[PDB]
Write a protein that binds this ligand. Sequence first.
Ligand SMILES: [Cl-]
Ligand SMILES: [Cl-]
Ligand SMILES: [Cl-]
Ligand SMILES: [Cl-]
Ligand SMILES: [Cl-]
Ligand SMILES: [Cl-]
Ligand SMILES: [Cl-]
Ligand SMILES: [Cl-]
Ligand SMILES: [Cl-]
Ligand SMILES: [Cl-]
Lengths: 206, 206, 206, 206, 208, 208
Amino acid sequence: WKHADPWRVLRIQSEFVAGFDALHEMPKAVTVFGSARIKEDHPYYKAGVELGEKLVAADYAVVTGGGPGLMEAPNKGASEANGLSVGLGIELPHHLNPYVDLGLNFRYFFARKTMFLKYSQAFVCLPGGFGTLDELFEVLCMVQTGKVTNFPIVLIGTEFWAGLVDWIRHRLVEEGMIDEKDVDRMLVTDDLDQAVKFIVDAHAGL
Amino acid sequence: NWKHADPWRVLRIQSEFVAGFDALHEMPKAVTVFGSARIKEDHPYYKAGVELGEKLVAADYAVVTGGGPGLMEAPNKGASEANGLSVGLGIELQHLNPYVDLGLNFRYFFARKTMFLKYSQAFVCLPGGFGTLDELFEVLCMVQTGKVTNFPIVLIGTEFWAGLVDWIRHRLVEEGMIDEKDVDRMLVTDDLDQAVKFIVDAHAGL
Amino acid sequence: WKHADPWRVLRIQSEFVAGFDALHEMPKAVTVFGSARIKEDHPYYKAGVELGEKLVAADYAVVTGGGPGLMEAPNKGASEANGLSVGLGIELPHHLNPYVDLGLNFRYFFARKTMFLKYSQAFVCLPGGFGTLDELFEVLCMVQTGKVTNFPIVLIGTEFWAGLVDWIRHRLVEEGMIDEKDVDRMLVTDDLDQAVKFIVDAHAGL
Amino acid sequence: NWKHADPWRVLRIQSEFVAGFDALHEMPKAVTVFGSARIKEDHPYYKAGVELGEKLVAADYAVVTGGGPGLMEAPNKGASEANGLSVGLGIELQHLNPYVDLGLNFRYFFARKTMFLKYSQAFVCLPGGFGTLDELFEVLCMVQTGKVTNFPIVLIGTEFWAGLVDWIRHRLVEEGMIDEKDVDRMLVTDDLDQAVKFIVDAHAGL
Amino acid sequence: HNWKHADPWRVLRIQSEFVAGFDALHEMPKAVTVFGSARIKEDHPYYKAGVELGEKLVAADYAVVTGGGPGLMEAPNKGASEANGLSVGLGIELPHHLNPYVDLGLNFRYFFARKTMFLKYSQAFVCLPGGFGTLDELFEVLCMVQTGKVTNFPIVLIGTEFWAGLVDWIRHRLVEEGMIDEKDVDRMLVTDDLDQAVKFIVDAHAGL
Amino acid sequence: HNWKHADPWRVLRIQSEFVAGFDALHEMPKAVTVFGSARIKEDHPYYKAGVELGEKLVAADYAVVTGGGPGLMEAPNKGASEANGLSVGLGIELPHHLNPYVDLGLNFRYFFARKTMFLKYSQAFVCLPGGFGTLDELFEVLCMVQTGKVTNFPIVLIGTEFWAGLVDWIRHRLVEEGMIDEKDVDRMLVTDDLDQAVKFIVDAHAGL
Ligand SMILES: [Cl-]
Ligand SMILES: [Cl-]
Ligand SMILES: [Cl-]
Ligand SMILES: [Cl-]
Ligand SMILES: [Cl-]
Ligand SMILES: [Cl-]
Ligand SMILES: [Cl-]
Ligand SMILES: [Cl-]
Ligand SMILES: [Cl-]
Ligand SMILES: [Cl-]
């Protein structure tokens, strides 16, 4: 019965109840994603740290998936600036980083994803792999369909993201897969103050 | 406003899992096919999705789509007209295309997505926008992390997908954000029988 | 809605699902209770430690409420003998001891109590206060009513328990509140080998 | 044997909480009264429980019991015959005594117990066996830990309870397992108006 | 609360135990009762002595009757049973069965009924070392011998070193203060020699 | 995919922008277009120069037309508006509004339509320091002056130090290699004196 569907449905539920209950009081927040593999002496990591700090300076909780690399970097920045640093972890066949103040673990991928969208009001993507891209395209869809509103999307690293963005222009816009505004609405930058200000300005007057 | 609050959200989520697990319980082996909703029937990508549907049914697979128009309908048409099993898992936003034999409509994005991974053993991406991309990188990340196994990923459209693949293959691999096998494992092709035999072979002996 | 009954019922459920799921694989076990206030240099604590070790030597997991004092003592004994030491903690207006290997935290008192009874097959009470006595009388009731069977109850500390046992004889038996066997079935001892053997012997042939 | 397995246990537990929260939703202020089920109507303890029921209703309380015979029936009779609100929360093991105006039957011990703490603001213990003792030390421990507040505890029967109180007061206090106020706070008396006024006073100004 | 927990039923239960005991033991052949500590284990010298005693009693054609429990009650039951003699156990029901060497077992709720059966259906008492349960039967038989309620009822203590201090106190204090007469104590044999014990019994029963 | 994303609709949209622009600006009084970097902030000396330029242009009875964005487009709009002159902004629609000092604003999707409106409805160009958008308009007006498609159309660069290296290259390299004639470059004024700039324009427009 443990692996059968009746228990499963109950377990799924149980995980949604737990998540919603533990995050119910969350203040305004930004979710930051990026590669788990990048090390602490890398420029992207330094930026992630600086991004953490500046978001807290703008009164935002920082939410990440709680792993190492470019999840750690923004948690570290936020925590050491004495803001609220949240890590929403996932059980993988593959542990929360030491800079997560409010740590949650999720068994179900789909429950954890829902949390990011329900308890933050913008996404910033530092450079990453498939996990980062999975989140980026999900939120681009949610914005495009109106399931979330006033939800800024920012990409950090111009060198890094250029190829993807060019392809989405050069091919998806050109072929009518998306509207121009679906890609245009994203900010792509190397400037963290402008990244934060872009978020503040889109959230001004709620 | 109980209708927008958590207790009701939880019951609705449960209701959706239950309805999908019940309806999909008996599913034989299957392939999920993704692609842009906006492409019309006289387009070559559409004609290709009809023929893919047909060949998948000739290989004894059920064909699963998101249930909408365009390149979700094409494979449902192919599969349907070949007298195999055609499935559409819609999202509430419009109705299921008229070539769905087994239809379900989901309100929750994340619930629908789960059902693709649970009730099919391969993903084929026809050209598409952000909804297709979102599904592609979700599966790439499930394969990468071992959460699914023997789960082939095919992209149809060499010209369309080239530039994405080139960015992945050069940005992500070179910066060390994925391993080279993580991208090489997927098939990129315009040859539909080669796509099907790719899938068959990866499922050999189950 | 958070403090209202619909969410509450869902939360209650969620906690039962989580507990049953995490303890489902438990091997045979004994629950040990006792005072949280007793210190590590006290005779009762030494006995609790020795009790831990001997239960593991008889192939039993040791389950406690995970707090300090005479919960810690049996966890320590069991853990340092490389057996399975379980701590089932409770959120109080009042943290698991360092010798808990499998630690769970419960919001609901009634869910945590159910766990002790469902995932152990005997109770041993070291000397304690009201929390210990609450558990002792609950299990005495469950045995008396047949809700659990082959469930040995042992009290440790002859000097300590004498007054209570004498009163339950001198008054509850004499007045017909309970049958003689309801108190007689308990072993009261200072001898830990005999405490363990009493449990082994009552569990022999399942 | 789905009927003894966890999925069904969970649904049954939920069903029981829901049914109790629904039926008890509107409860005015109340006292729970405990005592042995085996004492008959011509006994003085029974006569005392009838008069206690009556006086509780004269003080504008509903009277809550476990719903069975003996010293659970006596207060239901007193309360009932004085035209106040008489409640019985039975346990499945037999039926509710005939003086219950508002009856519910529970299969789960732990669910029933919760409802006493949630839907009454004082416990009175007539002489009883292990079921009474179990409830008494549960409330003692809730009061001690701050989980309930302004929650008076009265024991009726000075002769009957003396020896328990003397053991507590000397063993537990002297060995440092409880503080002296933890036992002094309860009232032990044969005077029923003194018992009621004890409760009224502890609830003064709500 | 219950009829069962009140004097009318208690009197019926009492009667029941006398009846069942008198009925089951009525036909007993000649017999010795052996008492001693329930706590001693099978590897202790006393245990081994108890086994040999049961064996020798049966070679003298006696049934061997005990309290039917463990330790130095089981030992003489073992001895007797394994020599193909009659081994009897009259147990007392206690919180937390008869030992496996008892071949005619009865079980008593009432200590006082059980104690009557030892005096009525055996004709000698032998006390291996023991505690308060043993000392209880000893002083009862001694008072039954002194009052004449039993006649020709030899009493033997085994373990000279174990018993010496009790027997010295009884002589130096009870005799000297006139609480007993000297023959009330001189008539017990105290010895370590089991053949002498059994011979004391045989000889005491002979010429009757 | 959409009618909207195809050439028939594009041609209609193009026509629409010319029509709306020709319609709205048809009545314009005499005007100068000012260009310069969108990136400079309001505390920079160039910004302050831009404000003063707008003020002085309006005192010479010119409307002041800009690209309607921030930085050194907003500065002359501010100058002009706050002197009670006509301040015009012809914006280009870009990912991520007209500046708040624009009092006659239009917004263009098509860069090429917008660039036509600057040439058709102003009679002088002044370029504050700027980047590639600025240099683009400069070399277009210069080519329109050299080809005779506009006449009596003065061109002024502000910031002698900023512009010197461009103007030196144009003389030492384009003239010397015969790519332009020397008057094609000598006819621009380069200066830091805003009254001289405005006087160069006035004088160039006089006696016509
Ligand atoms: Cl798509
Ligand atoms: Cl193709
Ligand atoms: Cl009771
Ligand atoms: Cl009383
Ligand atoms: Cl003894
Ligand atoms: Cl000896
Ligand atoms: Cl001798
Ligand atoms: Cl520019
Ligand atoms: Cl200047
Ligand atoms: Cl000058």
